[PDB]
Design a protein around this ligand. Structure first.
Ligand SMILES: COc1cc2cc(C(=O)CCC(=O)O)sc2cc1OC
Ligand SMILES: COc1cc2cc(C(=O)CCC(=O)O)sc2cc1OC
Lengths: 176, 176
């Protein structure tokens, strides 16, 4: 199916390439700024999975209690003929009553934007019914993949939601 | 199908985002070095589509007559919560009898690597027969998409091949 391929490609072409070196990038960042407690960037990449497939480019649109703090220093690798293909990732502060309550690397799973766009292009032959069903299947397949993936054990957290996003991220950050 | 989703996501999530600003990046690069004639970087992104799905990270492995020259200055854009997500692309020289015969931005279509890996993972439930059939369908769907795409008219060239790659790229570079 469309979602099956998308979940496998997101893992193979992106998560499996960035997750093994993520915790070293986070450790280097936290150690540089001596971040401890709430200011310490979480050891996991937090992946937003909106079931409605609405993927905005600016997170401080979905919730004002989610504030951009810094870029995580880039990872580079030679990839498919791109010399030093750059992997950029952003650190956000999660606010509660105006103060920093948590810190984490956060981004949306871009294949969910593909499902939304496919439902809008006539040549994709993909309905709004297909979009919602394939969004659920994408999330489930990705969960199944990451459960067994050797690169992705203790450094990734999926956040699926339907329509407070900051409270939800903080719920996850607090558990650990 | 798996290939249908991959071709649409490669277009939606990558080509449609980089192709509108590609020719300005190439123009700025050529103008900086006053590149004219064979040394002028082609106005099109050349996308390698190996039908066997073998995607190496270093192009100077597939053919020695393909030599890395320079990185095209990066494009950045806010994307899915990644502030200034970086789009890196590499310029290659295509050699003929030891001399530079052509110059172009070149890379492999990474979703073809996903098909190869999916055929190797038991949980993907995807055979070697599925890989070859879906590789052909990916190439065909991508060709169909780019034919009508408003962002991708005169700035992209697909190079599908089965097993000289340099001669094939040069065949395309010479036509224009
Ligand atoms: C769905 O397949 C892919 C997703 C994905 C996301 C990638 C990212 O860099 C995440 C941010 C973005 O989509 O720009 S690379 C990649 C490659 C894929 O297949 C080869
Ligand atoms: C197959 O779907 C995608 C492919 C792709 C390739 C991307 C690239 O940056 C090309 C180089 C690479 O794969 O690292 S971004 C991207 C996003 C996709 O879906 C959201």
């Amino acid at each position: 199916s469309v979602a099956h391929g998308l979940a496998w490609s997101y893992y193979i072409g992106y998560l499996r390439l960035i997750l093994p070196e993520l915790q070293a990038r986070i450790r280097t960042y936290n150690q540089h700024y001596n971040n401890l407690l709430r200011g310490a960037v979480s050891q996991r990449l937090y992946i937003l999975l909106p079931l409605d497939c609405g993927v905005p480019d600016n997170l401080s649109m979905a919730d004002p209690n989610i504030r951009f703090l810094d870029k995580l220093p880039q990872q580079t690798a030679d990839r498919a003929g791109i010399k030093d293909r750059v992997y950029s990732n952003s650190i956000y502060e999660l606010l509660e009553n105006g103060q920093r309550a948590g810190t984490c690397v956060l981004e949306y799973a871009t294949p969910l934007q593909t499902l939304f766009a496919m439902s809008q292009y006539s040549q994709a032959g993909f309905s709004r019914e297909d979009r919602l069903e394939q969004a659920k299947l994408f999330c489930q397949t990705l969960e199944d993949i990451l459960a067994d993936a050797p690169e992705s054990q203790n450094n990734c957290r999926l956040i699926a939601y339907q329509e407070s996003l900051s409270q939800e991220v903080l719920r996850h950050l607090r558990q650990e």
